[PDB]
Amino acid sequence: ASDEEFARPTGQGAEIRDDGETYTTVAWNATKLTEGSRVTDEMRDQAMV
Amino acid sequence: ASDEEFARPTGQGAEIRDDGETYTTVAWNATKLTEGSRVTDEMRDQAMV
Amino acid sequence: ATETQGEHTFPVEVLISGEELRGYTAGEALSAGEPVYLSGDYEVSASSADGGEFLGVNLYDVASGEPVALAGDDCEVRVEVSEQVTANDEILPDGLGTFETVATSAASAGVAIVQEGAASGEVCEAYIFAVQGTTA
Amino acid sequence: ATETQGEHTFPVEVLISGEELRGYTAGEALSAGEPVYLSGDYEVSASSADGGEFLGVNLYDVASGEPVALAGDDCEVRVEVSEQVTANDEILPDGLGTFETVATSAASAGVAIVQEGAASGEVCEAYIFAVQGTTA
Amino acid sequence: TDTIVNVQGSFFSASASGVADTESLLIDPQDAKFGAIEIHNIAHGGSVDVELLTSSDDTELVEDAAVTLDSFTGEGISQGNQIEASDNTNTYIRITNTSGGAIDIIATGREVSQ
Amino acid sequence: TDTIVNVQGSFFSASASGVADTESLLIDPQDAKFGAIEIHNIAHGGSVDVELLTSSDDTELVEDAAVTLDSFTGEGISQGNQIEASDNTNTYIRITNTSGGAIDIIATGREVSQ
Amino acid sequence: TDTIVNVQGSFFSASASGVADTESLLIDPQDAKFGAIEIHNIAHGGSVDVELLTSSDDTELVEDAAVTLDSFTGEGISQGNQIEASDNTNTYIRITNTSGGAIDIIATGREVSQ
Amino acid sequence: TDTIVNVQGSFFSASASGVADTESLLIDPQDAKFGAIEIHNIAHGGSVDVELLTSSDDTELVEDAAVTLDSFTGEGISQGNQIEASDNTNTYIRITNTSGGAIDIIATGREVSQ
Amino acid sequence: FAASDPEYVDTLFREQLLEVVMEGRELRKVAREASNVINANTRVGDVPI
Amino acid sequence: VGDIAGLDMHAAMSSATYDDGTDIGWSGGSETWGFSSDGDKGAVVYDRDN
Numbered sequence: 001a002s003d004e005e006f007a008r009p010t011g012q013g014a015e016i017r018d019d020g021e022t023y024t025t026v027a028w029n030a031t032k033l034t035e036g037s038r039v040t041d042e043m044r045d046q047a048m049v
Numbered sequence: 050a051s052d053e054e055f056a057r058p059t060g061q062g063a064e065i066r067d068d069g070e071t072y073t074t075v076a077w078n079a080t081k082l083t084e085g086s087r088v089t090d091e092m093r094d095q096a097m098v
Numbered sequence: 099a100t101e102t103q104g105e106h107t108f109p110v111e112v113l114i115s116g117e118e119l120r121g122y123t124a125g126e127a128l129s130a131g132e133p134v135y136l137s138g139d140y141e142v143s144a145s146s147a148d149g150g151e152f153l154g155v156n157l158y159d160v161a162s163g164e165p166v167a168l169a170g171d172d173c174e175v176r177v178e179v180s181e182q183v184t185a186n187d188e189i190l191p192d193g194l195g196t197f198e199t200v201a202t203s204a205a206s207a208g209v210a211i212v213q214e215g216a217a218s219g220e221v222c223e224a225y226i227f228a229v230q231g232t233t234a
Numbered sequence: 235a236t237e238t239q240g241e242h243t244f245p246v247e248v249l250i251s252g253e254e255l256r257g258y259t260a261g262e263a264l265s266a267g268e269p270v271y272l273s274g275d276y277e278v279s280a281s282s283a284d285g286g287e288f289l290g291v292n293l294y295d296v297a298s299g300e301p302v303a304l305a306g307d308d309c310e311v312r313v314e315v316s317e318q319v320t321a322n323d324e325i326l327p328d329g330l331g332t333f334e335t336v337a338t339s340a341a342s343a344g345v346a347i348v349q350e351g352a353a354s355g356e357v358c359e360a361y362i363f364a365v366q367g368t369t370a
Numbered sequence: 371t372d373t374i375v376n377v378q379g380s381f382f383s384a385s386a387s388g389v390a391d392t393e394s395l396l397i398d399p400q401d402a403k404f405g406a407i408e409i410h411n412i413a414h415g416g417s418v419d420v421e422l423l424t425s426s427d428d429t430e431l432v433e434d435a436a437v438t439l440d441s442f443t444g445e446g447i448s449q450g451n452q453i454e455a456s457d458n459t460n461t462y463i464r465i466t467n468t469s470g471g472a473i474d475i476i477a478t479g480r481e482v483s484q
Numbered sequence: 485t486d487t488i489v490n491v492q493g494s495f496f497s498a499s500a501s502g503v504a505d506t507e508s509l510l511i512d513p514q515d516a517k518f519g520a521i522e523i524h525n526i527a528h529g530g531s532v533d534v535e536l537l538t539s540s541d542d543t544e545l546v547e548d549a550a551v552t553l554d555s556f557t558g559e560g561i562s563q564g565n566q567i568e569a570s571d572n573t574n575t576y577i578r579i580t581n582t583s584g585g586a587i588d589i590i591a592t593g594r595e596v597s598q
Numbered sequence: 599t600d601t602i603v604n605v606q607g608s609f610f611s612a613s614a615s616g617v618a619d620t621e622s623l624l625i626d627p628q629d630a631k632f633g634a635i636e637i638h639n640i641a642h643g644g645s646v647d648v649e650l651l652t653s654s655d656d657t658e659l660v661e662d663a664a665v666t667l668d669s670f671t672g673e674g675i676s677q678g679n680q681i682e683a684s685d686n687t688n689t690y691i692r693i694t695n696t697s698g699g700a701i702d703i704i705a706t707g708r709e710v711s712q
Numbered sequence: 713t714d715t716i717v718n719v720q721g722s723f724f725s726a727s728a729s730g731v732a733d734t735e736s737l738l739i740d741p742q743d744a745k746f747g748a749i750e751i752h753n754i755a756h757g758g759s760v761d762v763e764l765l766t767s768s769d770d771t772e773l774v775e776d777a778a779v780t781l782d783s784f785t786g787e788g789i790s791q792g793n794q795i796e797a798s799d800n801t802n803t804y805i806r807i808t809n810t811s812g813g814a815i816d817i818i819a820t821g822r823e824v825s826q
Numbered sequence: 827f828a829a830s831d832p833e834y835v836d837t838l839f840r841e842q843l844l845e846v847v848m849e850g851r852e853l854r855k856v857a858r859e860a861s862n863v864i865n866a867n868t869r870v871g872d873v874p875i
Numbered sequence: 876v877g878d879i880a881g882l883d884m885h886a887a888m889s890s891a892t893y894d895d896g897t898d899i900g901w902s903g904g905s906e907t908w909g910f911s912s913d914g915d916k917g918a919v920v921y922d923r924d925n
């Protein structure tokens with residue numbers, strides 16, 4: 001939503017002017033964060049951990 | 050109202066003297082503050098709020 | 099403008115009809131029925147002669163810097179004229195707080211049309227149809 | 235036309251005051267605050283320069299063939315300008331989706347009066363008071 | 371070990387524009403918040419006499435003692451002075467114009483404890 | 485017995501590159517955080533007139549009093565000054581270029597308590 | 599990081615008006631609340647001898663040692679001195695008029711710790 | 713009543729050994745922990761130009777304004793200067809060798825608050 | 827124009843005057859707490875020292 | 876903060892709210908609302924009932 005404003009100083013009998021609540025968005029665009037690791041079968045067998 | 054003053058020293062059987070409450074005014078002159086907005090009926094239906 | 103009824107003076111009702119009633123700030127002291135133009139941002143001052151300076155007529159007396167109401171176009175108005183006006187005369191500001199005919203001014207088009215004729219210094223009934231500003 | 239409040243840009247509300255809001259059909263894709271003229275029967279397209287092509291301003295974005303709401307004369311509007319406007323400047327369509335002054339244009343009469351001044355590319359506040367069609 | 375930053379003083383100034391052909395600027399320590407003054411700079415838009423006075427009154431000027439410190443000739447600045455005055459010692463500094471017309475006088479310094 | 489280290493209070497500087505033949509650097513105490521300044525150094529890439537001004541307005545220079553302190557000739561440094569200016573006393577320092585062309589001006593000193 | 603503003607000194611002055619042809623102003627550190635004084639300014643309304651004295655009594659001047667520091671001539675100001683005196687060292691400063699007629703004398707300085 | 717001991721400053725120095733026939737020592741206030749410097753002593757093993765510069769970058773010297781303060785001939789000491797520079801004003805002091813052979817340069821002063 | 831305040835401010839109504847009068851400066855009253863108070867039997871009298 | 880120097884209410888106000896005369900139809904006050912430079916009025920201490 002738009003910021004709050006100050007009401008307007010006006011004459012008598014004058015039109016009340018429009019300054020309506022105005023809207024926008026922030027767009028999220030979720031980015032795929034990825035991580036890989038590869039290990040050989042002999043490595044997996046021989047390692048202590 | 051005027052500020053508080055001090056009573057006057059007086060003889061006995063003597064005429065009491067006058068320093069009564071004196072007055073003034075502070076003016077106000079209110080200004081009209083106005084705010085307006087307009088919404089279409091279709092906007093009013095469709096909005097999530 | 100004002101109306102004598104014996105010993106009494108009455109204010110003249112500037113607005114005959116219409117809803118073009120819009121809020122501005124007075125750039126000087128303005129009186130009811132006085133023609134005005136934009137001197138600053140939403141700020142209005144008394145019109146000068148020969149056109150290019152008209153937004154509306156001041157509805158009520160104001161001091162400098164106070165919020166003013168104007169009748170703009172599509173208002174029928176009671177206004178004071180500096181010369182004789184007949185019906186169907188086009189009028190614009192005279193620069194004297196009053197209106198004159200297009201025919202008398204150096205301008206070629208007006209801002210209001212006289213519905214009810216008046217003599218010099220008296221109230222005509224006119225319809226506001228245009229605004230005039232800076233064209234160079 | 236758009237407004238900045240921090241990092242945010244907001245769509246400007248084209249209409250400040252007025253009730254001269256009228257339905258047409260878009261002859262092309264139109265954007266909010268764009269000056270428009272009659273291109274066919276109840277059909278409006280964006281105005282070219284130098285006058286003779288103004289009915290009002292487009293109140294929201296439309297594709298070609300869609301129903302447009304138009305703000306006519308009697309509307310106070312937030313509109314974008316291509317040059318510096320002072321209050322009391324007359325403005326008319328630029329041909330570029332914007333308004334320019336009568337002084338700059340090859341025309342000699344405008345369609346709106348500037349109520350709040352603005353720089354080039356900024357949003358002025360204006361009152362629409364006239365229509366321009368073809369005169370030959 | 372304990373490390374503090376020192377701001378070097380509290381500022382004081384008296385100034386007058388268009389002081390007439392025989393008039394003066396009275397530099398009054400009662401205008402200082404700490405009660406005493408030390409004038410370092412006198413900038414003078416023309417010729418001036420500088421006078422130091424003791425008053426016989428605690429708050430007004432009623433000349434008890436007076437000494438003309440120096441006469442400055444032409445437009446310029448005297449800087450790095452230590453002309454000293456306070457309220458409780460009833461001391462005033464007077465800068466008197468001696469030029470054939472009006473001048474501007476700017477005096478600056480710092481406040482000292484009463 | 486209590487022992488304290490004194491570091492001197494805030495450095496102050498105003499500078500301009502390529503100031504034109506009749507233009508000026510205006511040293512404004514509003515730029516200091518303590519509100520008041522003492523100018524020790526004026527470095528000039530050509531001849532300059534130094535002028536001390538009082539304003540009639542609290543925030544902008546609208547000249548009330550003006551004294552030309554001195555004129556410096558050629559390129560160089562003036563150091564060991566105590567030219568004094570304050571925002572609350574509305575004093576400003578103007579260094580005006582008087583060379584037949586553009587110069588560089590750097591002025592430095594320290595902030596003093598207002 | 600901690601920042602302190604330094605207001606300098608506590609003010610000190612002694613003065614006399616119309617001191618006669620061979621009489622003196624006795625500047626006495628007993629009048630300082632910190633017990634000791636450093637005198638910067640001697641304003642003299644005529645010729646004066648400055649004399650520095652130790653007293654053999656704690657509270658009154660009974661001369662033990664005396665030295666005439668300098669002789670000033672005419673009406674004028676001597677400034678930026680550091681002439682120095684304290685009560686526990688029983689030191690007094692005497693300014694003696696030598697003008698052959700009555701003069702005004704103003705001395706100013708600051709209090710120093712005893 | 714409270715009595716405090718004042719130890720002055722924090723020490724600042726820049727030095728170069730055998731700076732070449734036309735090269736320079738760049739004194740940078742970023743090397744000081746308080747971010748501003750006041751140079752008092754310049755010792756030079758031969759003739760030098762002293763130059764005061766403002767940078768257009770917050771961290772590196774990219775010359776904006778430049779003034780040659782003075783030129784020192786021969787070998788010796790300049791003392792009691794107050795050449796001032798700071799990091800957030802991006803001020804710099806350059807000592808340039810003009811002797812035509814290799815020289816040693818030592819600048820000393822103290823740190824000042826930013 | 828139509829009927830409005832600035833036209834008829836002193837002809838169709840009177841500007842309000844507030845029903846409450848606002849007080850001036852009040853001086854601090856402490857003497858009775860701050861001293862020995864004698865409610866004397868006589869206008870003149872003596873205290874033995 | 877609501878109970879300092881004998882005061883019993885703190886009324887924290889915004890930077891924007893004083894009338895600087897930049898908004899349309901608002902005719903600016905005499906002062907500067909702020910606390911940054913000479914003549915800046917940064918606080919008002921007062922009787923709520925006056």
Ligand SMILES: [K+]
Pocket residue numbers: 171172227307308363
């Ligand atoms: K119309």
Ligand SMILES: [Mg+2]
Pocket residue numbers: 005019
């Ligand atoms: Mg808004």
Ligand SMILES: [Mg+2]
Pocket residue numbers: 064
């Ligand atoms: Mg009687």
Ligand SMILES: [Mg+2]
Pocket residue numbers: 054068
């Ligand atoms: Mg009374």
Ligand SMILES: [Mg+2]
Pocket residue numbers: 015117118119251252253308
């Ligand atoms: Mg309307």
Ligand SMILES: [Mg+2]
Pocket residue numbers: 427428429456457458459460461
């Ligand atoms: Mg006194």
Ligand SMILES: [Mg+2]
Pocket residue numbers: 428458
């Ligand atoms: Mg006293």
Ligand SMILES: [Mg+2]
Pocket residue numbers: 541542543570571572573574913
């Ligand atoms: Mg100021």
Ligand SMILES: [Mg+2]
Pocket residue numbers: 655656657684685686687688
């Ligand atoms: Mg003793």
Ligand SMILES: [Mg+2]
Pocket residue numbers: 685686
């Ligand atoms: Mg003893």
Ligand SMILES: [Mg+2]
Pocket residue numbers: 769770771798799800801802
């Ligand atoms: Mg930097």
Ligand SMILES: [Mg+2]
Pocket residue numbers: 770799800
């Ligand atoms: Mg920085």
Ligand SMILES: [Mg+2]
Pocket residue numbers: 870871872
């Ligand atoms: Mg008795």
Ligand SMILES: [Mg+2]
Pocket residue numbers: 542572913914
């Ligand atoms: Mg002030």
